[PDB]
Amino acid sequence: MINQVYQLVAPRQFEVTYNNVDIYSDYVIVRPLYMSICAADQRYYTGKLPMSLIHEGVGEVVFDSKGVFNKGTKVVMVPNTPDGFMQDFVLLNHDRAVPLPDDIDLSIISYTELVTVSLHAIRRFEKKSISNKNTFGIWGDGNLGYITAILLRKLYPESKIYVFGKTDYKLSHFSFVDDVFFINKIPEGLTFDHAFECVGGRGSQSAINQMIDYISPEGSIALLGVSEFPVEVNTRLVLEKGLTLIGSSRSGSKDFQDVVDLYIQYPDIVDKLALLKGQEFEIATINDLTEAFEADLSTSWGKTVLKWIM
Amino acid sequence: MINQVYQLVAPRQFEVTYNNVDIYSDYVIVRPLYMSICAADQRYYTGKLPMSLIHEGVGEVVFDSKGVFNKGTKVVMVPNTPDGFMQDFVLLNHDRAVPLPDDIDLSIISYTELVTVSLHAIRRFEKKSISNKNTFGIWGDGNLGYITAILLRKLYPESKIYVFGKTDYKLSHFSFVDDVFFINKIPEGLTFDHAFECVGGRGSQSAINQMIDYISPEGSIALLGVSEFPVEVNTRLVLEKGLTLIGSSRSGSKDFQDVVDLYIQYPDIVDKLALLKGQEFEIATINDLTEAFEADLSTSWGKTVLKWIM
């Protein structure tokens, strides 16, 4: 069987290559159905030169030679922890494909990787150490901040949550949060014992510095924002306050299974996650990809989803 | 009763003031016997202008109106967690003075605060999480690095310890360590799961960056070096590796009691700590203080101890 792989050959330039696919291999052959563009894929799109791009998606099983998943089973695809999804067929190990419930909105299950990242970070805090009596802080009014707020509220129901961001636009989407602040306007006496840093790039430095100042002593901080650079950190205060800083990144197949199991538990999560769904595009040519990527560039809030009909 | 307080009134300038002391107060009146100059006191000596300086010391109880400690009991003095010891009498709460065994070298028990700092840092790692099967790294071939190596070896006997420093002079004092390295010459494939950052100032940044690189994934790092400044930190790697960074500073009275209880357990500690004892000075005038402080400035390795005979 022949597989068409849609690779990025140059910034703002896609081209199709071919490779052979063994139906009777120990993998599970999957056709991607919906996928979502990620910031990391946008870095490459604009600026290992030939490669496939998307790595968050869900699809249907068209073949499973080992006979584990029946044909047509809708499954969320886990990528490799250290080749993308823009192709006619994706081959996964049987532990790298998580079955979904029979009826579910796939267009928003596409960005389940962000939820796994968020849930992984949350589980970095010992579950036995955190109750509904703690108080959480979240820097970042974007997708990670939103998903993290959702997860904390659903699974720490009686807890208190504060969100710190930069724009009224993005912060209005946080209604289930106990209170919402600007980084420009933080009141004195505000306190919390656990905090999540969901801001990237150069802004992560400012985020980290603020949560160092405002966090309660002996508090813990989970880092999520990628800097791809060094950031100045005030270590004197981490010492004086006894702060524990935990960095957490790539998630595991367990995080995907747990997130799926949570979709089953609180379908409220799927409905709240829908508010992250920005613009959607049906992809049937290459032109549809260039247009879709230009749109995710111009996108203010939320994720861009692609409907794979190649 | 009249107390003479020897304060620093100007950089390189001491002067004596007076204040009244109530023998019959709820405190315990203590005459300091031996004390040791600390880097923090040297910052002020050279460059809250009027204040007393030394904060690590041991002395004898001359009065205890509440009747808890008998007169002459030799006790290690705990300072206040957020006024110094260069005075004829020091008043402590009954929980701020730890009794010592009857026969012990006081000239080296003077710098028990460094041991409490080190032990506090070690206990930041959950004791149930660390066995004699772990492998420790220590940046810094100075006093904190030496004390930390001592404590780890005594209480994690079958564990492995590596020390990283800058000078052959200081690193030769580490013989009980499994192996000793330069920061200039670190071999590939070197690995460890828990690490201690015992370097201060601008050098802490380099230390932190190195232990970020070489530490095993999911490893923990205890920060001890004070920077009094920001330091660039590579957060991308803390994320990719899942590193947990714990800052730990001022110790508690529990740390002093535990350190004392350890002196009782392994008197080997007191003998190894003696190798830190640099130059000793009998202080009977102000001139003896200026000379002593100039000497702790010129000191390469170890602590400077003062014999209080004012």
Side-chain angles (χ1 to χ4, degrees), chain A residues 1-11 13-42 44-47 50-65 67-73 75-95 97-126 129-131 134-153 155-157 159 161-165 167-201 203-235 237-249 251-253 255-271 273-276 278-310, chain B residues 1-11 13-42 44-47 50-65 67-73 75-95 97-126 129-131 134-153 155-157 159 161-165 167-201 203-235 237-249 251-253 255-271 273-276 278-310:
Chain A
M1 182 156 68
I2 302 283
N3 189 16
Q4 295 169 124
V5 171
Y6 300 87
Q7 281 177 333
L8 188 74
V9 306
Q13 179 163 328
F14 285 107
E15 207 164 279
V16 55
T17 195
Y18 304 83
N19 79 326
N20 287 276
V21 168
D22 195 307
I23 298 94
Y24 308 94
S25 68
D26 206 5
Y27 301 147
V28 47
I29 294 93
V30 177
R31 171 165 176 90
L33 288 167
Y34 297 92
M35 55 186 51
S36 84
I37 287 184
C38 160
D41 315 331
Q42 289 285 357
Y44 296 67
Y45 179 40
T46 48
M51 68 187 310
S52 167
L53 279 180
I54 299 310
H55 290 75
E56 40 199 30
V58 65
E60 48 175 342
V61 172
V62 302
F63 289 116
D64 191 8
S65 175
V68 169
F69 294 151
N70 305 338
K71 312 202 207 61
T73 309
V75 299
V76 57
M77 310 178 283
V78 317
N80 269 318
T81 317
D83 208 359
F85 292 165
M86 302 200 328
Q87 52 213 57
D88 284 329
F89 298 105
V90 174
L91 304 98
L92 314 161
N93 309 72
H94 288 81
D95 57 9
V98 188
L100 294 191
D102 300 67
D103 206 328
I104 198 169
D105 188 329
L106 304 179
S107 66
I108 69 133
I109 304 302
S110 48
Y111 42 79
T112 308
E113 193 208 2
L114 256 56
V115 183
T116 54
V117 163
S118 190
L119 177 61
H120 193 237
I122 287 170
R123 286 173 176 203
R124 303 308 307 276
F125 300 142
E126 171 60 28
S129 70
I130 292 317
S131 69
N134 294 78
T135 302
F136 299 99
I138 290 168
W139 267 251
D141 51 9
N143 317 319
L144 260 174
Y146 188 68
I147 296 183
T148 315
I150 294 180
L151 288 154
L152 287 171
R153 173 57 71 222
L155 58 92
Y156 288 147
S159 54
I161 297 174
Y162 304 150
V163 172
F164 309 79
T167 47
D168 184 26
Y169 188 24
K170 302 186 187 179
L171 288 163
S172 45
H173 301 87
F174 304 79
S175 308
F176 42 89
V177 284
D178 291 3
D179 213 280
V180 157
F181 311 81
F182 280 33
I183 60 167
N184 222 358
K185 317 144 204 203
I186 314 181
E188 282 182 0
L190 190 58
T191 73
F192 47 96
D193 52 347
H194 280 256
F196 282 94
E197 199 270 342
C198 309
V199 183
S204 58
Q205 184 185 294
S206 175
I208 296 174
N209 276 0
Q210 264 189 355
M211 321 151 67
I212 281 297
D213 298 11
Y214 290 88
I215 188 83
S216 287
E218 283 204 290
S220 311
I221 294 175
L223 287 302
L224 294 179
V226 172
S227 164
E228 301 285 27
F229 268 148
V231 287
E232 306 272 13
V233 179
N234 189 286
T235 47
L237 260 72
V238 192
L239 293 163
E240 295 188 36
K241 302 219 215 172
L243 303 183
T244 84
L245 282 65
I246 310 183
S248 91
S249 196
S251 47
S253 325
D255 299 315
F256 279 92
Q257 183 69 252
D258 296 343
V259 168
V260 164
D261 290 333
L262 255 62
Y263 290 145
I264 290 180
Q265 191 171 356
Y266 317 88
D268 321 330
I269 312 177
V270 178
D271 290 318
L273 277 165
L275 279 55
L276 254 178
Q279 208 160 3
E280 195 189 72
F281 293 97
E282 281 183 328
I283 310 303
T285 81
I286 300 295
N287 254 356
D288 301 3
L289 281 174
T290 78
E291 184 180 21
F293 271 82
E294 306 279 31
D296 186 82
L297 284 186
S298 294
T299 300
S300 42
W301 162 265
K303 301 289 288 171
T304 307
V305 178
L306 308 187
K307 191 180 183 179
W308 205 246
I309 56 180
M310 283 290 204
Chain B
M1 182 156 68
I2 302 283
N3 189 16
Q4 295 169 124
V5 171
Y6 300 87
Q7 281 177 333
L8 188 74
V9 306
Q13 179 163 328
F14 285 107
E15 207 164 279
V16 55
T17 195
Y18 304 83
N19 79 326
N20 287 276
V21 168
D22 195 307
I23 298 94
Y24 308 94
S25 68
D26 206 5
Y27 301 147
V28 47
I29 294 93
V30 177
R31 171 165 176 90
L33 288 167
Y34 297 92
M35 55 186 51
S36 84
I37 287 184
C38 160
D41 315 331
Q42 289 285 357
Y44 296 67
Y45 179 40
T46 48
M51 68 187 310
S52 167
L53 279 180
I54 299 310
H55 290 75
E56 40 199 30
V58 65
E60 48 175 342
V61 172
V62 302
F63 289 116
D64 191 8
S65 175
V68 169
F69 294 152
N70 305 338
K71 312 202 207 61
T73 309
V75 299
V76 57
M77 310 178 283
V78 317
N80 269 318
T81 317
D83 208 359
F85 292 165
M86 302 200 328
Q87 52 213 57
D88 284 329
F89 298 105
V90 174
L91 304 98
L92 314 161
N93 309 72
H94 288 81
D95 57 9
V98 188
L100 294 191
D102 300 67
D103 206 328
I104 198 169
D105 188 329
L106 304 179
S107 66
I108 69 133
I109 304 302
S110 48
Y111 42 79
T112 308
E113 193 208 2
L114 256 56
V115 183
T116 54
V117 163
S118 190
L119 177 61
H120 193 237
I122 287 170
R123 286 173 176 203
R124 303 308 307 276
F125 300 142
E126 171 60 28
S129 70
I130 292 317
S131 69
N134 294 78
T135 302
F136 299 100
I138 290 168
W139 267 251
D141 51 9
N143 317 319
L144 260 174
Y146 188 68
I147 296 183
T148 315
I150 294 180
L151 288 154
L152 287 171
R153 173 57 71 222
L155 58 92
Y156 288 147
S159 54
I161 297 174
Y162 304 150
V163 172
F164 309 79
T167 47
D168 184 26
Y169 188 24
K170 302 186 187 179
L171 288 163
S172 45
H173 301 87
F174 304 79
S175 308
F176 42 89
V177 284
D178 291 3
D179 213 280
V180 157
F181 311 81
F182 280 33
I183 60 167
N184 222 358
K185 317 144 204 203
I186 314 181
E188 282 182 0
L190 190 58
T191 73
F192 47 96
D193 52 347
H194 280 256
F196 282 94
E197 199 270 342
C198 309
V199 183
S204 58
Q205 184 185 294
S206 175
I208 296 174
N209 276 0
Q210 264 189 355
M211 321 151 67
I212 281 297
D213 298 11
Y214 290 88
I215 188 83
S216 287
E218 283 204 290
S220 311
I221 294 175
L223 287 302
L224 294 179
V226 172
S227 164
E228 301 285 27
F229 268 148
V231 287
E232 306 272 13
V233 179
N234 189 286
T235 47
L237 260 72
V238 192
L239 293 163
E240 295 188 36
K241 302 219 215 172
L243 303 183
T244 84
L245 282 65
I246 310 183
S248 91
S249 196
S251 47
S253 325
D255 299 315
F256 279 92
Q257 183 69 252
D258 296 343
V259 168
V260 164
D261 290 333
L262 255 62
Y263 290 145
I264 290 180
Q265 191 171 356
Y266 317 88
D268 321 330
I269 312 177
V270 178
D271 290 318
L273 277 165
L275 279 55
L276 254 178
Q279 208 160 3
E280 195 189 72
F281 293 97
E282 281 183 328
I283 310 303
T285 81
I286 300 295
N287 254 356
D288 301 3
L289 281 174
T290 78
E291 184 180 21
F293 271 82
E294 306 279 31
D296 186 82
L297 284 186
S298 294
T299 300
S300 42
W301 162 265
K303 301 289 288 171
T304 307
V305 178
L306 308 187
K307 191 180 183 179
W308 205 246
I309 56 180
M310 283 290 204

